[PDB]
Design a binder for this molecule. Structure first.
Ligand SMILES: Nc1ncnc2c1ncn2[C@@H]1O[C@H](COP(=O)(O)OP(=O)(O)O)[C@@H](O)[C@H]1O
Ligand SMILES: Nc1ncnc2c1ncn2[C@@H]1O[C@H](COP(=O)(O)OP(=O)(O)O)[C@@H](O)[C@H]1O
Ligand SMILES: [Mg+2]
Ligand SMILES: [Mg+2]
Ligand SMILES: [Zn+2]
Ligand SMILES: [Zn+2]
Ligand SMILES: [Zn+2]
Lengths: 267, 621, 420, 646
């Protein structure tokens, strides 16, 4: 065991606000209906209108659009809690639920040419044309292993550290038992999520005529992998972050920036 | 979990709006007045009574008793925030640390720029600018714990224990906030010390030096720093609370600030404080883990049950002429008979006036030696006097011998020095030392006792120790048998040598047997016409007498001289008396006058002194 | 009592030929606060103070300083900023941050964290030839003319990093990165080993990305002026590093003047390249000057259009030097002013741009009229039927096989969008 | 200033920042002293301060009319010693705020006083030459009656305490100005100490070679230092408090000025310094230790006699006092007057008081080195053999509290090693050092041995060497030496059975070996005569103590006697001494009496010389030898004992 968090005022406030926003019975009921819809359709992502969130709570809107990662974590915790309240049996099926955004983003609506350093860690909405669309590779998030010698079964958990500092111990894939017995990975029991990387280019008509294009790299996790193909015009909403390099005693200031799409919609 | 801003508001509310009728029945803001005082810098220690807190907020009391350190800091910060609004005038700068605080505040105001936000570390620390200290007084509902039972399960809690103080270091300056001054910029740096050790800083982190990217070596110094009176004592279990076969357990108590100089070795104390650990790094820990020491941080020290630090009823009791006999009969009510012996013991407990005529001291202490056959309650009398007197050390034959009576030298821990620790005589320096089996006591110990009687000091010229101690104690020896063993050595020194022979006698033996059997029946002496005074009352009366120095009028000079000459003639005719006997007369008469609580001794006091002396003398025959 | 460790607190620097860097920063702050432009007749204003306030309120966080102003107010500051631009530029930057904070102090919630104020600079001194960039001018402030022939994408360069130890997870937040092309060597040993006797490994630190204060940075390729290149020679080149608000300020083709620090790459002192002690030189860009409506002009246009014979004055004014062709000149004025572009509810559009053709004998000044129209139009490109030299007529799009990006080669038609 | 080099003040510690802060006058940071105001106030105090209650005897060579310290500056001009002792009591009387500032900020204030004194002195004298600028010593600050009551609030303040010196370590050199030389071009530079440290050049100033500069230890400049372990004499002695040992530190002029056993009032700065966890690491302890940077040593005491140093000093008495003492000597009953003055509240012990007075005066020091004879003991030894309760202990304590360099031991509380010397581990240098004992601490004074019979021979044997040759030859495992122990022994003995049997002879009652008893040159039998008049008068005196010559004149008389009185035997006194010894031996040949050996002729010479010194004769006379005879005879009650029985 390690340093767990006992109580966190900001996280508690954020989760309470998001659960209140999602619970709509004294209000019109838009988002209660939307959650019921996704339950019926067997999905695990909810599209929440930033305009509605700003209308019901300006502070939560500003916090979500300016510090997206932890705010989206709190929003997704609230979403899972609400889905459990509506029906726990379905909430148990899916490990986590995701919160994509839509609506109008005032200054966070940018093109790949205008997506600069100022928008790091913020939620941004970028409309552009797809140029590159890599293959959908499975990324293992929970690996099950079996030791024929001792008949034991083990589970190794890998955190999604795409943009967080990652240490080798996290990514060590186990192959031998404690006493160096061989471990066989059980693919039927392990858990993998589809992962894809695409590139969004400034629309040729909207880009300045004189200069060369500008593009941004977009990471699509499960449920957002095959939504776009090269040449399509799409709107991707997500967090603009910095990718960690690799372990090294020397580093240049340069960082490789990407966009972890939280939702992708067709032009 | 709890919101400590809300807790701070709660403690502010209590400290501001708590009132009591303590001041002569008139309603008073008990803590408001104290806040005014210590905002004016007229008071230093603020003792928050958790009974007072529980009077209106029991849950706050429970939270304090569970996390006392946290709430100790909350209370201190609340007091500091409230002080400015309670200040009503300018302090007179009674202290150099007050001068430093004034200069610091003035310069911070001068360079305020109120709207600007200064970095969290670019500010004076709280402890650097307090000049006060907040302690608790444990709630009465909390039963005192046993030092043995105070364990890891109650770390950080507020607990109160009682025991005998064995070892107490001296008061020495303990750094609380180390102040450094740079050699380039001219700012100051503050290191709040929390661990038992600290590594002095080398580089000045001031903004000016950081911008200049200069050396910025800073110099630790004591001028601007913040020390606190510090002491470390060892507190020992009480005999009655130790398990069947075990030895008493000790606890370490760290005393700070105004709690210092309260307790001294040998005192029976009750200490209330927080049970806190000290990290135990540095050693080659055999077992893995974060092992730590344990100590009690002293918040409230109260001498109790032997050395606790008026009414019309007691004034009338004193005014009664038979008050002397009342006290005498109250001395050990269980012991039947020995009326004159108990009167002599009372005179011992009171003592005569000290004299300092032209460069030589005639001490007023009274020395009494109880010679007697077996089973005449000499040991019981000495034990009772030990329990009664404030500073009493009861030493048996040889268990406390050599350095058990005289001081020795022991290595320290706070300083690692060689500190001189007193023996039984020093622990009873200005009280009563009840020596039992004085005849069988060693020769060196007997010579030490003779020296303390003759001089009240203890000179030592051994290898590790070379000092002239001070032991102004009164010796109450209880030897057994010139009859059959009546040393002139004892005769020449003891001011009152009493022989207690128990010749068989039907009537007296039957009365004593009835007394004993009733005592064993009812755990108390047989009821008498006068109820014996409680030990607290006896101590109070004796203490009040002690500070009532009566002088000897020149009128009694010839009377005393005539009595002394008559006794000299009687002794010469018979088959011992000297200036020692005359001084015994003088100091016994002075102590009797003091008991009567007058300023001038009288012929009645002289006659009583002579009567007791003659009873002692003819006890020999 | 040995468990917790409070920080190290400190106070202000009360009390107390070279001038200390704090003194020079104070002088920069006073220059920003107390530089006065105007006259008693026209009043006085604090140019840099009000510029800082306006920029910070708008959300810019940058200003531009005039070297002539700085030298007039405090000549020694100007000389220091010329001789050692880097350190003194940082001093000026922090002075600007302080002045901005104290002029916008009552900021609303949310916008409370004081932001860094970039300080670009410009001077009226004539720029120096690129070929004059000898070695005596290394690390100095240099103003050079050139033309940008390329501009890399804008990427994120970290200004602060937070490195966390793998063993104890303790952090070393806020490590000040150097500006420009330069790297940082991470600490090899976790200094916070006192919290526990068992020791952390060697080279234990991983950079935490999410705790990095990054800024925009860009790389440009400056080429000597073609009119500056001697007759038989090659165009010299230089590499430009551009910072937060110098990114995308210029685009390929612009003829610019760059004021910056002549600096060499410092990345660790580690077939071809037979030389030794040679490092990639570059100019760290501080100020970019790209070379070639007020209410007064608003009311001027209003009155000029309100004139009765606006049509006649415009027609006679466009091409004064060409004889005759009055009808063609009126048509040219109508072409310049254009009709009205319309979109109907169904979505269709009606163009508001007139199309004019001038068939005629070669003697007439048709080419001259076209040249004047191109020169006078707000956005106007003069080309030929077969495009132009290295510039097509219409637009083509080609996918680059390597990067897969669709490069849009723009012809005259797409370059003169909303124009002539 | 006149070009004189301003020597540093190591006692005032490492110089501080000295930050000036304006309160809107221009105080020093953390204080309320302004250098200009303090300097002006002290300059005024020097220029015009007169003591109205001053006495011509209290101040010698000082007019009570002219300003006090201007005469002191004149003295410092006459002699080379550039020091000025200034009484903090005088400062308090003149300017109370100046006194408070001095006491609370010594390091800051005292340099201002130094500046002021230098200014005045060099203005008055434009030609006087001094090795260094005059330095001010503030003493007599309000006495701290107990160090245990001082608090962290008092740190770095000028306090004053009193006590006897237990030990004085060796001369420790301290760096003041490092000398550096280049290992390439031999370029030389000097780096003065600054705030308790030195900055290495790190670069040569001539060849610019980095780190070519090396420190030259023995070409640097150093200053003296000395640890002094002192035992406090707290006037206020709370119950249960043991004696106190406090570390002192002398600096560059007070080093080796107070020997062990000397009693002194030490004024100095009360310092607190950190304790390293180990002598090799720099981690320190949260709890500091305290010591005293000594500023001033004062030997003079009111309740004691003049010390050896004061007696040695020439200007100890005014001519008026000298004439007064000579008149008191020419007085015919000076002997009895002084005997009665000694222990004024001890009733008619005339002979014992006379003997103790002779012990205080002491015989003559003789240089028998040329004779190859050895060293002769000029001290007088007294043994009071008496019943307990005969006031012998009171007389012992009176002498102990009266004499400088006095030590006291009782009964079985002492040991041979503890009296002679021993080896301990000085717990500040972690080094093994040698610590003296009582007999050495009382080297040039008195040792009072109460309960001299309960002194088991193991330790009583030590006294033979001390009382015979004034030497203590220690030959232990590592250290061999002979310590000077030129003490005078005053011992108290109790007859066997604690009571004097009136049937056993003198020796049988004393029960001390003749080898030892022959060393004591005076033995007084405190025996009780059952006398009505004695008992009545004693009772009157003892009761009078219960309701109600000058120490000054006695002290001055003894000091003058020791200073310039060296009695020499005359021919008539020599013949008288010969006859006295033969008669005394003839008498002592008796069975049980105290037999007389030539040690008794030595004792008679000692006593006669002491009496001549008391008379200031400078020539021992038949009167003195006869008085010695009478005293030695009345002691032991030879007249009252028959040559057969007691
Ligand atoms: N006079 C007395 N009155 C009451 N109890 C007595 C008396 N004398 C002796 N005793 C009892 O006898 C026992 C022995 O007494 P102790 O104090 O040992 O006498 P000693 O001092 O002679 O040894 C004790 O338990 C005590 O209670
Ligand atoms: N009407 C005119 N007025 C003044 N100058 C003229 C006129 N026509 C022609 N020119 C001159 O003769 C030159 C030839 O005309 P040009 O611009 O080549 O037209 P184009 O080649 O299109 O017929 C022009 O550069 C101009 O200077
Ligand atoms: Mg007994
Ligand atoms: Mg043409
Ligand atoms: Zn500094
Ligand atoms: Zn680590
Ligand atoms: Zn050199």
């Amino acid at each position: 065991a390690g340093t767990v968090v006992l109580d966190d005022v900001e996280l508690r406030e954020a989760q309470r606000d998001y659960l209140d926003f999602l619970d709509d019975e004294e209000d019109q009921g838009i988002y209660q209906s939307k959650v019921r819809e996704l339950i019926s359709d067997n999905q695990y992502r909810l599209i929440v209108n930033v305009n509605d969130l700003r209308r019901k709570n300006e502070k939560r809107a500003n916090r979500l659009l300016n510090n997206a990662f932890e705010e989206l974590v709190a929003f997704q915790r609230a979403l899972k809690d609400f889905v459990a309240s509506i029906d726990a049996t379905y909430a148990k099926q899916y490990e986590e639920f995701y919160v994509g955004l839509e609506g109008s983003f005032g200054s966070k609506h940018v093109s790949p040419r205008t997506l600069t350093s100022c928008f790091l860690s913020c939620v941004v909405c970028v409309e552009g044309i797809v140029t590159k669309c890599s293959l959908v590779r499975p990324k293992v998030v929970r690996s099950v292993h079996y030791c024929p010698a001792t008949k034991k079964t083990i589970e190794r958990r890998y955190s999604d550290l795409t943009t967080l500092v990652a240490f080798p111990s996290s990514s060590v894939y186990p192959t031998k038992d404690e006493e160096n017995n061989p471990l066989e990975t059980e693919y039927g029991l392990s858990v993998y999520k589809d992962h894809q990387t695409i590139t969004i280019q400034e629309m040729p008509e909207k880009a300045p005529a004189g200069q060369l294009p500008r593009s941004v790299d977009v990471i699509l996790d499960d449920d957002l992998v095959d939504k776009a193909k090269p040449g399509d015009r799409v709107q991707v909403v997500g967090t603009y972050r910095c990718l960690p390099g690799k372990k090294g005693g020397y580093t240049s200031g340069t960082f490789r920036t990407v966009l972890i799409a939280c939702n992708v919609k067709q032009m | 979990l709890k919101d400590y801003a809300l807790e701070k508001e709660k403690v502010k509310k209590f400290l501001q709006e708590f009132y009591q009728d303590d001041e002569l029945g008139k309603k008073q803001f008990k803590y408001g007045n104290q806040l005014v005082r210590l905002a004016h810098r007229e008071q230093v220690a603020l003792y928050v009574d958790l009974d007072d807190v529980a009077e209106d907020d029991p849950e706050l009391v429970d939270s304090i008793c569970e996390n006392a350190r946290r709430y100790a800091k909350l209370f201190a910060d609340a007091v500091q925030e409230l002080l400015p609004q309670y200040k009503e005038r300018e302090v007179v700068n009674k202290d150099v640390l007050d001068v430093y605080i004034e200069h610091r505040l003035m310069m911070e105001q001068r360079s305020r720029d109120p709207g600007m936000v200064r970095s969290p570390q670019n500010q004076y620390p709280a402890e650097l600018m307090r000049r006060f200290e907040l302690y608790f007084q444990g709630p009465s509902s909390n039963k005192p714990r046993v030092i043995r039972e105070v364990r890891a399960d109650s770390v950080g809690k507020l607990v109160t224990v009682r025991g005998i103080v064995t070892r107490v270091s001296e008061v020495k300056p303990k750094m609380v906030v180390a102040t450094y001054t740079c050699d380039q910029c001219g700012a100051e740096t503050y290191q709040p010390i929390q661990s038992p050790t600290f590594m002095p800083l080398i580089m000045c982190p001031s903004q000016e030096c950081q911008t200049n990217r200069s050396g910025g070596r800073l110099y630790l110094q004591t001028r601007g720093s913040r020390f606190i009176k510090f002491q470390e004592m060892k507190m020992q279990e009480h005999s009655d609370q130790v398990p069947v076969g075990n030895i008493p357990r000790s606890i370490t108590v760290l005393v700070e600030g105004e709690n210092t100089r309260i307790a001294q070795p040998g005192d029976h104390v009750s200490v209330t404080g927080i049970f806190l650990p000290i990290l135990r790094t540095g050693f080659r820990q055999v077992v893995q883990g974060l092992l730590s020491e344990t100590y009690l941080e002293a918040h409230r020290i109260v001498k109790m049950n032997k050395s606790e630090d008026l009414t019309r009823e007691e004034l009338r009791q004193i005014a009664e002429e038979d008050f002397y006999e009342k006290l005498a009969a109250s001395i050990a009510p269980e012991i039947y008979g020995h009326e004159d012996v108990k009167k002599a013991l009372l005179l011992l407990l009171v003592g005569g006036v000290d004299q300092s005529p032209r460069g030589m001291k005639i001490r007023g202490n009274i020395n009494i030696c109880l010679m007697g056959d077996p089973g005449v309650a000499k040991s019981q009398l000495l034990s009772y006097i030990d329990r009664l007197a404030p500073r009493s050390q009861y030493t048996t034959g040889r268990g406390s011998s050599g350095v058990g009576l005289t001081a020795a030298v022991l290595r320290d821990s706070v300083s690692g020095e060689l500190t001189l620790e007193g023996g039984a005589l020093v622990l009873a320096d200005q009280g009563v030392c009840c020596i039992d089996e004085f005849d069988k006591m060693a020769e060196a110990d007997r010579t030490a006792i003779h020296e303390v009687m003759e001089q009240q000091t203890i000179s030592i010229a051994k290898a590790g120790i070379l000092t002239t101690l001070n032991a102004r104690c009164s010796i109450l020896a209880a030897a057994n048998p010139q009859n059959i063993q009546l040393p002139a050595a004892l005769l020449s020194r003891f001011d009152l040598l009493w022989l207690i022979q128990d010749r068989p006698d039907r009537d007296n033996d039957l009365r004593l047997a009835q007394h004993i059997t009733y005592v064993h029946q009812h755990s108390r002496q047989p009821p008498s016409q006068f109820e014996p005074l409680d030990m607290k009352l006896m101590r109070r009366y004796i203490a009040m007498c002690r500070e009532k120095q009566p002088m000897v009028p020149e009128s009694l000079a010839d009377y005393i001289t005539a009595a002394y000459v008559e006794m000299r003639r009687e002794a010469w005719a018979s088959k011992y008396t000297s200036a020692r006997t005359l001084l015994a007369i003088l100091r016994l008469s002075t102590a009797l006058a003091r008991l009567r609580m007058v300023d001038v001794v009288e012929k009645e006091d002289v006659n009583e002194a002579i009567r007791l002396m003659e009873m002692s003398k003819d006890s020999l025959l | 009592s040995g468990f917790d460790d409070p920080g190290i607190f400190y106070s202000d620097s009360f009390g107390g030929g070279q001038a200390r860097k704090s003194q020079l920063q104070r002088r920069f702050k006073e220059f920003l606060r107390q530089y006065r432009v105007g006259t008693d007749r026209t009043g006085f204003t604090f140019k840099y103070r009000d510029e800082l306030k306006r920029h910070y309120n708008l959300g810019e966080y940058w200003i531009e300083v005039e070297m002539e102003d700085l030298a007039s107010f405090d000549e020694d500051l100007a000389d220091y900023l010329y001789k050692q631009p880097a350190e003194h530029l940082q001093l000026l930057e922090e002075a600007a941050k302080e002045v901005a904070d104290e002029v916008t102090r009552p900021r609303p919630s949310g916008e409370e964290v004081l932001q860094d104020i970039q300080v670009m600079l410009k001077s009226d001194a004539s720029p120096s030839s690129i070929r004059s960039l000898k070695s005596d001018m290394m690390s100095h402030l240099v103003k050079i003319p050139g033309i940008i022939i390329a501009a890399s994408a804008v990427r994120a360069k970290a200004t602060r990093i937070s490195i966390q130890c793998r063993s104890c997870r303790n952090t070393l937040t806020n490590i000040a990165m150097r500006p420009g092309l330069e790297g940082y060597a991470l600490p090899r040993k976790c200094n916070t080993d006192q919290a526990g006797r068992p020791k952390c490994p060697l080279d234990p630190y991983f950079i935490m990305p999410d705790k990095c204060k990054c800024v925009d940075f860009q790389t440009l390729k400056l080429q000597e002026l073609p009119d500056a290149v001697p007759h038989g020679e090659m165009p010299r080149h230089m590499q430009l590093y551009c910072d937060r608000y110098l990114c995308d300020k210029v685009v390929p083709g612009n003829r610019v003047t760059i004021m910056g620090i002549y600096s060499i790459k410092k990345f660790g002192l580690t077939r071809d390249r037979v030389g030794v002690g040679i490092r990639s030189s570059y100019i760290r860009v501080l100020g970019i000057q790209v070379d070639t409506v007020s209410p007064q002009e608003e009311e001027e246009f209003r009155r000029l259009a309100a004139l009765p014979n606006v049509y006649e004055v415009i027609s006679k004014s466009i091409a004064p030097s060409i004889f005759g062709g009055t009808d063609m000149k009126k048509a040219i004025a109508c072409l310049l002013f254009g009709g009205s572009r319309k979109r109907l509810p169904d979505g269709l559009t009606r163009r508001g741009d007139i199309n004019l053709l001038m068939l005629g004998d070669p003697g007439t000044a048709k080419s001259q009229l076209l040249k004047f129209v191109e020169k006078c139009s707000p956005i106007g490109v003069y080309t030929s039927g077969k495009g132009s030299s290295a510039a097509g007529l219409t637009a083509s799009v080609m996918r680059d096989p390597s990067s897969r990006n669709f490069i849009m080669e723009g012809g005259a038609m797409v370059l003169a969008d909303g124009g002539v | 200033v006149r070009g004189t080099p301003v020597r540093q003040r190591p006692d005032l510690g490492s110089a501080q920042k000295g930050l000036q802060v304006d309160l809107q006058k221009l105080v020093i940071w953390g204080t309320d002293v302004n250098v200009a105001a303090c300097k002006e106030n002290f300059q005024r105090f020097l220029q015009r301060f007169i003591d109205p209650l001053a006495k011509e005897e209290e101040n010698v060579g000082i007019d009570i009319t002219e300003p006090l310290y201007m005469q002191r500056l004149g003295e410092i001009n006459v002699i080379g010693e550039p020091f000025l002792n200034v009484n903090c009591e005088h400062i308090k009387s003149f300017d109370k705020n100046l006194y408070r500032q001095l006491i609370s900020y010594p390091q800051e204030v005292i340099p201002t006083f130094d500046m002021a004194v230098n200014e005045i002195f060099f203005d008055r004298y434009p030609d006087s030459i001094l090795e260094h600028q005059i330095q001010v010593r503030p003493f007599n600050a309000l006495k701290t009656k107990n160090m245990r009551n001082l608090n962290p609030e008092d740190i770095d303040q000028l306090i004053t305490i009193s006590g006897m010196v237990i030990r004085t370590s060796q001369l420790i050199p301290e760096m003041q100005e490092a000398f550096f030389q280049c290992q390439v071009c031999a370029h030389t530079t000097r780096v003065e100490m600054d705030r308790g440290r030195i900055a290495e050049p790190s670069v040569c100033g001539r060849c610019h070679t980095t780190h070519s500069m090396a420190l030259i230890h023995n070409r640097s400049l150093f200053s003296d230092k000395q640890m002094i372990k002192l035992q406090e004499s707290p006037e206020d002695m709370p119950a249960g408090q043991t004696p106190h040992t406090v570390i002192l530190f002398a600096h560059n002029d007070l080093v080796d000025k107070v020997q062990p056993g000397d009693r002194v009032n030490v004024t100095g700065i009360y310092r607190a310094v950190p304790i390293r966890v180990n002598p090799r690491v720099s981690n320190v302890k949260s709890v500091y230790k305290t010591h005293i940077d000594v500023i001033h040593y004062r030997k003079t005491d009111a309740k004691r006699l003049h010390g050896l140093d004061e007696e040695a000093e020439q200007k100890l008495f005014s001519e008026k006092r000298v004439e007064l003492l000579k008149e008191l000597s020419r007085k015919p009953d000076i002997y009895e007057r002084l005997a009665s003055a000694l222990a004024p509240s001890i009733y008619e012990h005339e002979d014992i008081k006379k003997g103790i007075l002779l012990q205080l005066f002491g015989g003559t020091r003789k240089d028998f080195s040329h004779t190859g004879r050895g060293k002769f003991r000029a001290e007088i030894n007294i043994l009071l053999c008496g019943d307990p309760g005969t006031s012998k202990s009171q007389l012992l304590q009176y002498v102990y509290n009266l004499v400088p360099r006095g030590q006291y031991t009782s009964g079985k509380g002492s040991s041979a090693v503890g009296l002679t010397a021993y080896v301990m581990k000085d717990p500040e240098t972690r080094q093994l050092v040698l610590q003296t004992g009582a007999l050495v601490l009382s080297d040039n004074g008195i040792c009072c041995i109460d309960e001299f019979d309960k002194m088991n021979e193991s330790t009583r044997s030590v006294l033979h060497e001390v009382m015979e040759q004034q030497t203590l030859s220690i030959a232990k495992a590592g250290i061999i030496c002979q310590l000077n122990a030129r003490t005078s022994v005053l011992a108290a003995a109790n007859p066997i059975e604690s009571q004097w049997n009136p049937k056993k002879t003198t020796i049988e009652n004393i029960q001390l070996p003749h080898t030892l008893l022959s060393r004591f040159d005076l033995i007084f039998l405190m025996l009780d005569p059952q006398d009505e008049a004695y008992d009545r008068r004693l009772a009157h005196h003892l009761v009078a103590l219960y309701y109600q010559l000058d120490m000054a004149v006695l002290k001055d008389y003894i000091a003058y006697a020791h200073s310039t009185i060296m009695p020499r035997l005359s021919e008539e006194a020599s013949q008288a001494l010969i006859e006295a010894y033969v008669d005394m031996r003839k008498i002592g040949s008796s069975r049980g009496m105290v037999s007389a050996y030539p040690r008794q002729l030595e004792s008679l010479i000692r006593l006669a010389e002491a009496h001549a010194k008391v008379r200031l004769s400078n020539k021992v006379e038949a009167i003195d030898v006869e008085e010695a005879k009478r005293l030695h005879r009345e002691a032991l009650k030879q007249s009252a004992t028959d040559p057969r029985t007691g």
